[PDB]
Amino acid sequence: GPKANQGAINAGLRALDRSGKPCRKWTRGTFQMKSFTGVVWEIPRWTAPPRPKP
Amino acid sequence: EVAALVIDNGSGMCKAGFAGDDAPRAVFPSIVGRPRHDSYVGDEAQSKRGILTLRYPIEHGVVTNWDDMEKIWHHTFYNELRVAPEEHPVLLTEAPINPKSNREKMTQIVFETFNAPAFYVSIQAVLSLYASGRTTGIVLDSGDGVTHVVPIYEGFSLPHAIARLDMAGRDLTDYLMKILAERGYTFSTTAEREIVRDIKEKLCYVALDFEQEIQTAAQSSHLEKSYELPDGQVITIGNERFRAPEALFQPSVLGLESGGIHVTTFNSIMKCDVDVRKDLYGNIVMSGGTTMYPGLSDRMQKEITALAPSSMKVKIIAPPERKYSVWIGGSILASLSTFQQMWISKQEYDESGPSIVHRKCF
Amino acid sequence: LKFQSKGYNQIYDQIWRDLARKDVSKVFRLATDSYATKASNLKKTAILASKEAKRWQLRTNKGTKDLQARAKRVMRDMMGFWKRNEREERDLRKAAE
Amino acid sequence: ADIYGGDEVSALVLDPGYCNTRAGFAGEEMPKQVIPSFYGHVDGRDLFGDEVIVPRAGFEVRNYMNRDSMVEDWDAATRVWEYLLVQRLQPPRPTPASKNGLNVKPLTENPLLMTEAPWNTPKAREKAIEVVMENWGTPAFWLSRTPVLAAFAAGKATALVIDVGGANTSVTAIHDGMVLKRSIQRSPAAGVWLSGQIRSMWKSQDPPVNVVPTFMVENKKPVEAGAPPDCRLRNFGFPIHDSFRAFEEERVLTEFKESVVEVWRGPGKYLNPGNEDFAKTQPGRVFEFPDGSNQMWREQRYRVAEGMWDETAAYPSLNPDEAAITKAQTIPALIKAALDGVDVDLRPNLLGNVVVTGSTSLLNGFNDRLNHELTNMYPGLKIKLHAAGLTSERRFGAWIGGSILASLGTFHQMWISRKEYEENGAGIVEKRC
Amino acid sequence: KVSERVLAREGLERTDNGMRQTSWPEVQPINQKNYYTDYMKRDDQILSLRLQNEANRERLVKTAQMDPSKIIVIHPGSQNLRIGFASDALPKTIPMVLGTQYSQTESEMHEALPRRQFEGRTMEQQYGEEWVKKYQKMCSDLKVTMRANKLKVLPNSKDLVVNFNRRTEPEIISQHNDPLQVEWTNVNKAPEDGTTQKVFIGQQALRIAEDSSPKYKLWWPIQHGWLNEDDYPTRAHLFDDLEMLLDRALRRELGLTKKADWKQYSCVIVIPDLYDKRYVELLLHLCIEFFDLSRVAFIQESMAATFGAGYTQACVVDVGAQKTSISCVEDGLVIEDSRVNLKYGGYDVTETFIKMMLYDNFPYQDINLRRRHDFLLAEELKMKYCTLSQANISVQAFDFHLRAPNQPTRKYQFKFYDEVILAPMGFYDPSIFDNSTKLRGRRKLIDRSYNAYDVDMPDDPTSSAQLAILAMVQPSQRSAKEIAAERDAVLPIAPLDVAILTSIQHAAKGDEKKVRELVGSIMVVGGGAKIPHFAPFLEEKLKIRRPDLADRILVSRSAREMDEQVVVWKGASVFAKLSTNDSWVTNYEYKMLGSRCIYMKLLWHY
DNA sequence: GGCACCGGCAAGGTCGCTGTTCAATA
DNA sequence: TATTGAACAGCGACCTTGCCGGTGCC
Ligand SMILES: Nc1ncnc2c1ncn2[C@@H]1O[C@H](COP(=O)(O)OP(=O)(O)OP(=O)(O)O)[C@@H](O)[C@H]1O
Ligand SMILES: Nc1ncnc2c1ncn2[C@@H]1O[C@H](COP(=O)(O)OP(=O)(O)OP(=O)(O)O)[C@@H](O)[C@H]1O
Ligand SMILES: Nc1ncnc2c1ncn2[C@@H]1O[C@H](COP(=O)(O)OP(=O)(O)OP(=O)(O)O)[C@@H](O)[C@H]1O
Ligand SMILES: [Mg+2]
Ligand SMILES: [Mg+2]
Ligand SMILES: [Mg+2]
């Protein structure tokens, strides 16, 4: 049947992390932007904690 | 392997079901009840209203309280559909020109709260067009809380041309309470308002010629339908039947400055590129619960023909399923093989945060 | 005094020169191609989805044979109903006034 | 870092103009919201949007822009830009729970880029930032001239922009993304003037042609070319204001412009001896008024447009106090004077990169005639005409340029910071050109 | 000359802000080669079928361990509605008319029927030249036929009748000498059957007097087998009338007086073989939105006729009041291309019978079938005397009583001779029927049905046999909309014999064996067929048209000793009761998907 | 020489159309 | 024993893409 078909067509379905771990969590944080005259100002920006690897 | 879930959430009734099916499994009021001095959703919240304050988390088509909205999705997956979202991709519908920030917040919630593996946000008017079987047209979409007119050409909606008539199915219920109070009844409390909503759905209709109707209503016996309340008392309603829907065509009748749905349609077509207009007149599509009154198709055919040039051919498309067209179109879209290339995967969300919805759900 | 030194003129000018010659140029190509792609995706998708929406109404050989079978099922059931009601001698009417 | 997502900077981009005002976010091919600059006024409150302009007792139609394409009504400007940038593009606050019938500063995250006409004066520029920094709590601000953004919307760093707007026709040379000041040339011979030509021409056919705007007809029946109209009119319990009828007639004039009027594109001016005589012999164009009244138009369809190319052709102004257009206000004179504002070595480069903009440039034949006139007045040079836009939809050119500008990474160093403003106040004349 | 160290000390420094070169969206193309779709691929996914699987499974569980008294069977009609429970022997029959207060009666709004120019050049203009010549030729043909059939004819006959009729003059009796006492409806009296509005239906509507203190008008929502748009100001008013009539039939004939209880009942609705899809989708909506019945099911009149009979295969000729229809049924379907639908029936025989006698100086020249007592008189006279039996014809004398409202009863003697056979015989030359206004208003309020996705394509049924009969009246690149509009402009009319053979040839589709089975299987139904010797006469007319079939032709009236009016109803009741019928649209389906679920559920291609 | 528009072509699977064979009914 | 509901096998029509190529800009 078509949903079982291997190769390129179903590359999305086989990639699903069904019943997997929690995704990382996002918070509205703040980023510092600098003008060409050196002045600093703040924009709200999405942020999340890093993803380490030993 | 399991199908994606399709969620069509609105100002009145939320609808939910499986991609591929031709109708939703769950249809329930978008009401959240809280104890005033635990929480409850849908018919359960209406059944025990005495110990609760009720709110709607969606107002004029747009989510306005997220803490309450998340209780509706929780109820939808675990109490209505009986499925765990972490097994399924999700399709959410979205109002025409709702704010950017809302797309980010609904994205945030279905990943971080419900762990769904992949998801997509979709413009309600475009889905309702797919469900009518065409690529190009203008959708008059009219729900409980808002009415929109949306031109779409080759499957792309035209944001600059969208015109929002901010009056809809609740206003026509309130207006019908008001004019029934003038006939000597009384319907002031919520327990009566839910009766008056049912009275629209059974008895109201759109006049073909309002002047002829409101003149001949003086003599007509046939017009005066009777209806039995829960208390067994019988009301009778007469010219109230068509005066209530007429407010779509004359928003002065319920006291606001706006064009009626025929004029807002016409104006929205006329804001489009000159070459496209001939195609839009040939493809006027009706969507949403408020478009369900008998006669509305005909009055829209007439009223837009009166505004358009004599050389145009004007066509109203109003398919029988139109109350759920927005959900049906989502079912179609989520059940094509190509949907797999469209959706945001949880792996993209992890990489990109909620802003990914601006890149992919274009 | 601010915003009038020869250096301020130079930096402002240089920013806008690079911005116009390099960045505007690349982003215009990307914007136009991106739009073309987006419009194509939506055209394709609208075509598939609109076909599917109508597909249920198209007649088929298989659907026609199933429907002929349902009609024949009911027709034999009706004949069996008349076998039973004949073999048990169904009566009907009295018309006194 | 790796703590941030796909998010960068969500600029708002705002483009006021005499006929229409445009707003939306950067990084999109079109503005989300476009409304008539003509606001409504009733019972002491202002009303916005083409869905709201409707017949009511005492309804008066007003515009916050003057025909210099500049703001002349900053109080109304404030309310119109609050309606766009706040009420239609931000999350709504919810109703109180008691009111719903069940129970018995705004812009702090979006910088604003705003569009000015190129002759907009220092005091008007100052008041634009003063309004913004007081009213909405915006983080940072930028103001830029329509010619620059039209050039960016065609992908050109150096260009000659011809910009045939509503209240004004403009020509300007853009080089390395900045306007060459000496080159700026401006003229009334534009979309609004062209409506005056059309009205004059209608009031001077053999039977006079009367325009009755869409709202005054309830119902109509089709009738033959040149026949008397067949319709029945609305009647109102109040006087319709002259201002309202004048705005609701403008839609009918816009249909005639977009679908009947044609620039004479042929060899030489329309009044040259053979051209006018030939034009009367051609197949015409059909048109209908909201009245149902129908007619075929032949030689007039050229003459209403021809006036902006040759002043000799123009009909008498229907307003008797309006000044008639001079030679120096015709499109060829503007172009010739504009280029004579610029160094001779730079002219071939500009002429190779002509960018056309504004809805009056969408007249049938306008690009043809502009190509011919440029050819005959600058022989021996390559002429090439570009539209401003990412799409066939060419109406929003100067907005689109802002949406591209506000999306470039190198641009964000430019915004005048809330802090940078509150320390200085008059920074915007200097830290912007 | 420029330098970075000066700019650093001035506080000027060009900066990327850590941003990407551009934040314009970059879009990847979708790939569609060999795409597939899961939309409505399985019965599990289609709501109408999901619900049926659940219902079947529940009934199997109930077997491991529905009631006909809760099923209502409705069959609408241009004069009569049959309604009853599926439990029952027989339906109750009531006239499908609704009576209400109004400013003017039927009689006061229109010209008299049968149509006459009361001012004009003698009888020839008064009745119309062609009509009078038709009548003359038919009379001659009958005399020739009787003589050829070796039966007596008096050389003069009309002159014995006409001179009696025009000289008789009526007699008045009722104050003193005992008549049948008619009883006019007491319109002032309140309804007892559970409602406030003083509307009337059925026989109690027809017996409202022409003058009463509140003035009353009668409305018929069905005529000639279709929705009666000619008589109605607006669509909404017509839907409200059909709803009021059926509502009052449930309360007044079935006795289902409490509106709350109706949600327990289910409904079988019979429809014609060539339905208007707007009429089907109206009847579904009445039964589910207004009456809120639990389930609705449909069956075609000819399909149902065979279920009443217990026939596997038949040709069903259905002679109504105003419609006549023919189709062939085999293997559990009406054969889609066989369907024929002619716009005449037993009412036209009544009008024509009155009009023929009027021309022959019938005493009551003031008669006008829009007046209620006149209509009832004309129908009674029709049913008493109209006769296709050729042998019993003679000069005969009879009498009738005009019990007009609030006037002493007038008695008329009269004579007839051949009006009694020539008016019925109009089925074999329909040019004598007053077909002049049947087509008036036929798209006035309700449009032709179009496909829901492609609104320039008609979706009403079509049949080769019907188009063959249109071509027979009016010999017949444009759009399907324009072609349908041209066909709509011709009234379908043909001789009855020719219509049958035309139906059967398209049924067989060029196969003499299929013809030779169907032609031996003619089944006649419908009230218009109840005229004496109708079936033998129809057989004889086919035999003398097709010698190649003449020994095999067999025409049977009714089935299994039923009355010809009820066979269709009985059939629809058997379809209700039998176990295998999954054809029901449930209330929950129609609330969800409207008329879309009919296409999923019927036992034919809708 | 890189990259692009436009075109004819070879090719992949899903889908409906055609057909054989089987277990089961009565 | 004739007929049925169903699983299974086989084939062509169809839409869509990548490929090789002519012609062209830069
Ligand atoms: N048959 C009917 N006739 C008239 N009105 C109806 C009918 N059925 C439903 N409605 C009305 O439709 C409205 C609900 O429409 P819908 O479900 O489309 O609301 P919604 O989608 O939640 O609204 P929105 O999309 O605006 O948020 C209600 O006012 C309801 O009373
Ligand atoms: N399709 C069209 N063809 C020609 N003219 C048009 C068309 N559509 C609109 N117009 C006219 O062109 C003008 C449109 O406004 P436009 O965007 O060109 O100017 P603007 O930028 O709003 O005003 P400003 O003159 O201040 O720049 C109006 O005068 C309008 O009547
Ligand atoms: N005993 C009878 N003998 C002869 N004709 C009769 C008799 N009883 C009724 N009729 C005639 O039969 C006609 C047909 O009645 P029937 O109920 O079959 O028509 P209908 O189904 O109500 O209407 P339609 O024409 O739409 O089918 C009546 O209109 C009447 O003229
Ligand atoms: Mg909705
Ligand atoms: Mg402008
Ligand atoms: Mg009948």
Nearest nt to the CA of C36 via C1' is F5
CA A43 to chain D, closest CA, distance in angstroms equals 6
Pocket test for ligand 1, best of B63, B323, B324, B326 (most atoms within 8 A of CB): B323
Q: Computed from CA positions of residues E569, E571, E575, E577, in that sequence, does the dihedral angle turn out positive or negative?
A: positive
Residue B123 near residue B230, CB atoms below 8 Å: no
D254 touches chain C (CB under 8 A): no
Is the preceding peptide bond at D283 cis, omega within 30 degrees of 0? no
Contacts of C42 in chain D (CB under 8 A): none
Neighbours of chain B (3+ CB pairs under 8 A): A, C, D, E
The answer to whether residue E72 sits within a structural domain is: no
Q: Is the CB of E580 under 7 A from strand F?
A: no
Which among A9, A33, A36 has the least Cβ separation from residue E13?
A: A36
Pick from D30, D117, D22, D2: nearest CA to D66 = D117
Task: Report residue B45: phi and psi, to 5°.
Answer: -65, -40
Contact yes or no for B292/B322 (Cβ under 8 A): yes
CA distance B210 to B217: 10
Report residue D91 as tokens.
Answer: 């999350």
Strand F reaches within 7 A of the C40 CB = no
- Residue in this structure with the two tokens 């977009």, named with its chain if needed: D258
Its domain, for residue A41, covers: 24-49
* Residue A34 contacts C, CB cutoff 8 Å: no
Q: Where are the alpha helices (DSSP H) in B164-308?
A: 169-182, 190-203, 210-216, 240-246, 261-270, 277-281, 296-307
Closest listed ligand to the CA of B176: 1
Distance from CA of C97 to the nearest CA of E (A): 15
Is the Cβ pair A33, D431 closer than 8 Å? no
Beta pairing partners, E85: E72
C-alpha gyration radius of chain E: 31
What does DSSP assign to residue D7?
Answer: -
**A34·E12 Cβ contact <8 A:** no
Q: Which atom of ligand 3 is nearest to the CA of E531?
A: 4
Strand D60-63 and strand D45-47: pairing? unpaired
Q: Which of residues 7-46 of E touch strand F (CB under 7 A)?
A: 33-37
Assess contact for B183 and B165: CB atoms under 8 A: no
DSSP state letters, B289-340: GGGGSTTHHHHHHHHHHHHS-TT----EE--TTGGGHHHHHHHHHHHBTTHH
Any C CB within 8 A of A41 CB: no
Instruction: Please report, for chain C, the start and end positions of each structural domain, with discontinuous segments joined by +.
Output: 1-58, 59-89
Q: Please tell me whether residue E543 adopts helix, strand or coil conformation.
A: helix
For ligand 2, say whether the CB of D357 is within 6 Å of any of its atoms.
Answer: no
Q: A36 and chain C: CB distance < 8 Å anywhere?
A: yes
Give one DSSP letter per residue of D375-421, joined into a string. Answer: HHHSTTS---EEESSSSS--TTHHHHHHHHHTTBGGGGGTSEEHHHH
CA–CA separation, E112 vs B83, rounded Å? 70
| Joined tokens for residue A49 | 């904690």
Query: Cα separation of E575 and E318, whole Å?
Result: 19
What are the C-alpha distances in Å from D271 to residues B133, D195, D267, D309?
53, 21, 11, 11
Is residue E139 situated within a structural domain?
A: yes
The three-point CA angle B241-B246-B252 to 5° equals 130
Strand B316-317 with B147-153, pairing: unpaired
Tell me, in angstroms, the distance from the centre of ligand 3 to residue E376's CA. 13
What is the β-pairing status of strands B156-157 and B147-153? antiparallel
Q: CB-based contact (8 Å) between C61 and chain D?
A: no
With a CB cutoff of 8 Å and minimum separation 6, the contacts of E511 are none
Q: What's the distance, Cα to Cα, between the start and end of chain C in Å?
A: 118
Amino acid symbol at D420: E
Write the CB contacts of B29 (distance below 8 Å, at least 6 apart in sequence).
Answer: B12, B13, B14, B42, B43, B45, B46
CB proximity E62–strand F (7 Å threshold)? no
E406 residue type, one letter: N
The pair of structure tokens assigned to B332 is: 């179609």
As for how many domains chain A has, the answer is 1
Sign of CA dihedral C54, C58, C62, C63: positive
Alpha helix positions (H), D85-176: 122-135, 146-153
Residue whose C-alpha is closest to residue B217's, from B186, B241, B200:
B241
Contacts of C65 (CB under 8 A, 6+ apart): none
Which of D14, D18, D19 to mutate to test ligand 2, by most ligand atoms within 8 A of the CB atom? D19
Residues of D in contact with C17 (CB under 8 A): 157, 176-177
Per the annotation, binding residues of D for ATP are 18-20, 22, 69, 166-168, 254, 257-258, 359
Task: Please tell me the number of Cα atoms within 13 Å of B270 on its side-chain side.
Answer: 20
Domain span at E389: 129-176+347-432
Within 13 A of D23's CA, how many CA atoms are on the CB side?
25
Q: Shortest CA distance to B133 belongs to which of E569, D271, E596?
A: E596
E372 in Cβ contact with E408 (< 8 Å) = no
The response to whether residue E221 sits with its C-beta less than 6 Å from ligand 3 reads: no
Task: Tell me if A33 and E36 make a contact (CB, 8 A cut-off).
Answer: no
Does the residue E394 lie in any domain? yes
Residues followed by a gap in chain B, C→N > 2.5 Å: 37
Count of beta carbons in the 10 Å neighbourhood of residue D432 = 16
Q: Which nucleotides of G are covered by protein (CB under 7 A)?
A: 4-5, 15-18
Q: What are the b/e assignments for D10-40, b being 16+ CB within 10 Å?
A: bbbbbbbbbbbbbbbbbbbbbbbbbbbbbbb
A30 belongs to a structural domain = yes
Name the residue with tokens 């914007």.
Answer: C31
CATH number at residue E172: 3.90.640.10
Tell me how far the alpha carbon of residue B30 lies from the centroid of ligand 4, in angstroms: 12
CA distance E465 to E303: 18
Ligand 3 midpoint to CA E518 (Å): 25
Q: Which residue of D has its CA nearest to A47?
A: D4
Q: Helix E372-385 vs helix E346-359: angle between axes, to the nearest 10 degrees?
A: 90
Atom of ligand 2 nearest to the CA of D195: 31
Query: Is E77 a pocket residue for ligand 3 (Cβ < 6 Å)?
Result: yes
C-alpha distances (whole Å) from B192 to each of B71, B197, E567 are 26, 9, 48
Contacts A26 to B, Cβ<8 Å? 108, 112, 353-354
Nearest CA to ligand 1 atom 10: B289
CB-CB contact of C78 with B166 (8 Å): no
Instruction: Name the token pair of E496.
Output: 């009855």
For C19-81, the DSSP string reads IIIIIIHHHHHHHHHHHHHHHHHHHHHHHHHHHHHHHTTS--HHHHHHHHHHHHHHHHHHHHH
User: Within 13 Å and on the Cβ side, how many CA atoms surround A7?
Assistant: 6
The count of structural domains within chain E is 1
The closest residue, in CA terms, to atom 15 on ligand 3 is E527
Contacts 24+ apart (CB under 8 A), C90-94: C92/E89, C92/E90, C93/E89, C93/E90
Give the distance (Å) from ligand 3 centre to CA of residue E321.
5
Cβ contact B274–D258 (<8 Å) = yes
Give CA separation, E127 vs D216, E121, E223, in Å: 51, 10, 24
The C-alpha atoms of residue E73 and residue E308 are separated, in whole angstroms, by 13
Angle at E44 between CA E42 and CA E50, to 5 degrees: 130
Nearest to D379 by CA among D348, D355, D353: D348
Residues 20-79 of C with CB under 8 A from E: 23, 26-27, 30-31, 34, 37-38, 40-41, 44-45, 48, 52-57, 59, 64, 67-68, 70-75, 77-79
- Smallest Cβ–Cβ distance between E17 and the set D1, D407, D412 belongs to D412
Ligand approaching nearest to the C-alpha of E341: 3
CB pairs < 8 Å spanning B and E: 118
Residue B16's closest CA among B114, B62, B83? B83
Is residue E401 in a domain?
A: yes
* 3-state SS class at D174: strand
Which of A2, A8, A37 lies at the smallest CB-CB distance from E36? A2
* Helix (H/G/I), strand (E/B), else coil: D47: strand
| CB burial string B127-166: b at 16+ within 10 A, e below | bbbbbbbbbbbbbbbbbbbbbbbbbbbebbbbbbbbbbbb
Ligand 3 atom 16: residue of nearest CA: E527
State how far the alpha carbon of A1 is from the alpha carbons of D98, D267, E37, E38, E553, in Å.
55, 67, 11, 11, 55
B247: helix, strand or coil: coil
Q: How far is CA D119 from CA B227, D145, D186, in A?
A: 69, 9, 9
**φ, ψ (nearest 5 deg) of residue D278:** -65, -45
Determine the Cα–Cα distance for residues B322 and B287; give it in Å rounded to an integer. 5
Maximum alpha-carbon separation in chain B = 70
Is E272 near ligand 3, meaning CB less than 6 Å away? no
Pocket test for ligand 1, best of B28, B200, B261 (most atoms within 8 A of CB): B200
User: Looking at chain A, which residue has its C-alpha nearest residue D414?
Assistant: A35
Among residues B147, B101, B103, the alpha carbon closest in space to that of B128 is found at B147
Q: Distance (Å, rounded) from C-alpha E171 to C-alpha D31?
A: 90
Q: What is the CA radius of gyration of chain D?
A: 24
| Cα–Cα distance, E528 to E347 (Å, whole number) | 8
Distance from the Cα of E292 to chain D's closest Cα (Å) equals: 27
Which technique was the structure solved with, according to the deposited record?
cryo-EM
* Chain F nucleotides covered by protein, CB below 7 Å: 12-18
Q: Is E33 exposed, middle or buried (0-12, 13-18, 19+ CB in 10 A)?
A: exposed
The residue whose CA is least distant from atom 2 of ligand 1 is B201
Beta strands in B124-188 (DSSP E): 137-142, 147-153, 156-157, 163-165
The answer to whether D24 touches D402, Cβ cutoff 8 Å, is no
